[PDB]
């Protein structure tokens, strides 16, 4: 722990310009990383809103909200995902699941073998929009190759 | 009146107006007639789609005007501006003395190709996109005159003469391409004491003796060949003539002239070629 | 008020501007797809979402009003001076034809573009108008071989002298 | 630029979310295999197939940058904040080993899933982002091809 007036990484780059990196694929990524801050992991909001019911919370976790689209955990009673427990009534030939509380809707596909059915787990745009900076050496190696 | 068309601001034969004094090219006017109106003219003196089509029908009584562009579409690309009568000009090619000897930055003014000044051939040219000077006699098309002193000139040593046309959105930025090979584009790229004076004098002396020995050995080997240079290079035309007059088809440079003759008379591949002497009656 | 234009259309507009006001070239006015086919071709493609009836009526009103209106501005304010002469000749070769039957969508996008200006004289209708203006713009740019020309014509030698050249 | 294709098995990521946070658990993070031992696998997997010099040079640059990039990000923005005190626990055990060689490839795929939202903070050109996202999605596919020995099979219900 240093005493006095502590400063974060943004308060660090607030006073002294850090050195930059050469030109490779990750240069700008490195700079962005060094610049901003530390903070926890946040899944993409495209991912948490994928399964029905579940959603983030205020500094929160997998929230198994009660189940009430074309590829989530479809149920044969009310078309609801399996809240809190992905175990449902299925067989080796079943197609749609049925909750353990919805076992009144246990189904059976049109199959030949009688399998074990139970609690289981399953626009044109501009052709020139900007100027590009290049490096002389990649250009030179490109030319020599061609 | 005013002596400019009230639509396009142009000079010419005006249909003027008596009451509301303006001028129209009479085809820049209202529905073009053709011409020829000598008596008084008086050119136009006088919440749903319902009211907006009433706007449509109200546009009638307001004396036509030319079309230009909105401020957002003409002022969008780089180096594009309107004229004074609303035509398209390039504002990046705007703004001569033949004999220049020293620039105002106090440097010599020597051609980029032959290295000599504006005294061997009477005139020199200065590039506006570089720091290079050229003799109009050295460019390869040779300039017979000189450009105007109001448009900029561009020396032969740029790539703008081969990149086709692209126009830039005038607020684009420069994207730093970090991709260390195989980047595709079409030409829109920017690019990213000993204090020895005695040694210098000795350097120069020994270099000069090197050069002297070099040419002293060149002339030794050249000057002993004069006797065969003269013989062959001066009896050549008579050897060519002795080959042609004897009709040597083995002189592979004779039959190439014979093929030039077949290629001048535009021979048709159907007839047989003539004997090599009889094709020579193309010449006379 | 302001509408948004596909940057491809800005590039094309400025190319036409330079091509006629500086390079002395012309659009070959008799248009294979005209301004009247290019509104029916939009109605018959947009009618698939005409669910509510008030919207159907407003869409119909707008399309009819705007074709008859483009007919009332092709002589006033949709031409550069170098395009007035070619006007007369066609007005003399087709005497009593509607203009939104000869000219094309090259001259019609000039009317869509120039309408935050002409709209200054405002409850709902302007918004529903500009909405179809934008959708028409991006419906035209998608069909660049249905509503646009493949070359500008070279203005004839006798033509230049009659306008001021 | 905006999109990846997470193949519909990594059903794992969100599960990873639950245990650490709700069904309180942990990953003890001395790990074998480590990140560095899998990149250097997929590299050797694919680099035997690239034809020209351009392809092998860009692949090599991306992979080296990726080991170094996982190094510099793994600390500040790649942990669920319950594997944070335990991160301090492990930071005292090994002081002389870089972070790119103590974690299996289960945090790396968190990087893989959150990369595009990070390339939407920089002004890269279309070909940089295109090849980058292509390579990392190919890596995700290769990982689901071999998840036997790469991903963990249990969780460490640990004290605070
Ligand atoms: Zn006029
Ligand atoms: Zn010269
Ligand atoms: Zn120059």
Curated annotation (Swiss-Prot), chain A:
What is the top-level taxon of the source organism?
Eukaryota
Kindly provide the name given to this protein in its UniProt entry: Uncharacterized protein C16C9.05
* Coiled-coil regions listed: none
Q: Which organism is it from?
A: Schizosaccharomyces pombe (strain 972 / ATCC 24843)
Swiss-Prot record, chain B:
Its recorded name reads Uncharacterized protein C2F7.07c
Q: List membrane-spanning regions.
A: none
Q: Which start and end residues of the full protein are shown? A: 262 to 606 of 607
Top-level taxon of the source organism: Eukaryota
Q: Where are the zinc fingers (PHD-type)?
A: 2-46, 108-161
The scientific name of the source species is Schizosaccharomyces pombe (strain 972 / ATCC 24843) (Fission yeast)
UniProtKB/Swiss-Prot annotation, chain C:
Compartments annotated for it: namely: Nucleus
Q: Which organism is it from?
A: Schizosaccharomyces pombe (strain 972 / ATCC 24843)
Subunit notes for this chain? Component of the NuA4 histone acetyltransferase complex. Heterotetramer of alp13, clr6, prw1 and pst2.
Q: What is the lineage of its organism?
A: Eukaryota, Fungi, Dikarya, Ascomycota, Taphrinomycotina
Protein name per Swiss-Prot or TrEMBL: Chromatin modification-related protein eaf3
Member of which family? Belongs to the MRG family.
Which parts pass through the membrane?
Answer: none
The MRG domain sits at 1-164
Q: What is this protein's function? A: Component of the NuA4 histone acetyltransferase complex which is involved in transcriptional activation of selected genes principally by acetylation of nucleosomal histone H4 and H2A. The NuA4 complex is also involved in DNA repair. Also involved in deacetylation of histones, chromatin assembly and chromosome segregation. May act as a transcriptional oscillator, directing histone deacetylases to specific chromosomal domains.
Superkingdom assignment: Eukaryota
């Amino acid at each position: 722990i240093p005493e006095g007036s502590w400063f974060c990484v943004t308060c660090s780059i607030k006073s002294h310009h850090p050195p930059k990196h050469p030109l490779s694929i990750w240069s700008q990524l490195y700079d962005w990383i060094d610049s901003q801050n530390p903070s926890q992991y946040r899944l993409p909001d495209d991912l948490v809103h994928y399964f029905h019911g579940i959603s983030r919370g205020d500094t929160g976790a997998y929230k198994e909200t009660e189940g009430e689209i074309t590829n989530l955990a479809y149920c044969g009673y009310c078309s609801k995902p399996s809240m809190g427990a992905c175990w449902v009534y299925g067989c080796q030939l079943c197609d749609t699941f049925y909750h353990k509380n919805c076992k009144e809707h246990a189904k059976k596909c049109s199959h030949d073998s009688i399998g074990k059915k139970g609690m289981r787990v399953p626009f044109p745009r501009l052709p020139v929009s900007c100027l590009y900076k290049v490096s002389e050496d990649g250009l030179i190696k490109d030319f020599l190759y061609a | 009146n005013n002596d400019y068309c009230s639509a396009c601001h142009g000079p010419g034969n005006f249909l003027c107006c008596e009451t509301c004094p303006n001028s129209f090219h009479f085809t820049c006017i209202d529905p073009p007639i053709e011409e020829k109106n000598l008596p008084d003219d008086a050119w136009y003196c006088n919440t749903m789609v319902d009211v907006w089509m009433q706007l449509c029908t109200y546009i009638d009584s307001h004396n036509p005007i030319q079309f230009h562009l909105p401020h957002s579409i003409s002022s969008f690309f780089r180096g594009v501006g309107s004229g004074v009568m609303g035509e398209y000009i390039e504002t990046d090619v705007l703004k001569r003395d033949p004999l220049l000897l020293k620039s105002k930055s106090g440097t010599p003014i020597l051609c980029f190709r032959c290295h000599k000044s504006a005294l061997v051939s009477q005139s020199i040219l200065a590039c506006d996109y570089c720091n290079s000077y050229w003799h109009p006699d050295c460019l390869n098309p040779p300039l017979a005159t000189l450009p105007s002193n109001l448009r900029k000139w561009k020396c032969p040593n740029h790539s703008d003469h081969v990149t086709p046309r692209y126009r830039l959105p005038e607020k684009a930025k420069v994207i730093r391409v970090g991709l260390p090979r195989g980047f595709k584009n079409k030409g829109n790229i920017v690019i990213d004491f000993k204090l020895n004076f005695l040694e210098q004098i000795r350097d120069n002396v020994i270099n000069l003796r090197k050069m002297v020995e070099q040419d002293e050995q060149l002339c030794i080997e050249t000057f002993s060949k004069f006797d065969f240079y003269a013989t062959r290079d001066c009896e050549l035309p008579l050897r060519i003539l002795c080959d042609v007059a004897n009709d040597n088809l083995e002189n592979d440079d004779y039959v190439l002239a014979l093929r030039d003759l077949l290629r001048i008379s535009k021979w048709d591949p159907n007839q047989p070629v003539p004997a090599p002497f009889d094709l020579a009656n193309l010449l006379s | 008020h302001k509408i948004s234009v596909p940057d491809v259309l800005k590039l094309w507009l400025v190319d036409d501007w330079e091509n006629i006001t500086k390079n002395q070239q012309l659009i070959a006015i008799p248009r294979n797809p005209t301004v009247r086919a290019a509104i029916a071709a939009f109605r018959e493609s947009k009618i698939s979402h005409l669910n509510n009836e008030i919207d159907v009526d407003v869409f119909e009103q707008a399309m009819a009003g705007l074709v008859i209106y483009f007919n009332k501005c092709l002589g006033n304010m949709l031409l550069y001076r170098f395009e007035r002469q070619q006007y007369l000749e066609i007005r003399q070769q087709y005497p009593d034809t509607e203009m939104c039957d000869l000219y094309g969508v090259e001259h019609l996008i000039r009317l869509f573009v120039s309408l935050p200006e002409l709209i200054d004289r405002d409850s709902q209708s302007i918004e529903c108008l500009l909405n179809y203006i934008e959708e028409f713009l991006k419906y035209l740019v998608l069909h660049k071989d249905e509503y646009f020309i493949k070359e500008y014509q070279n203005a004839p030698p006798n033509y230049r002298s009659l306008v001021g050249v």
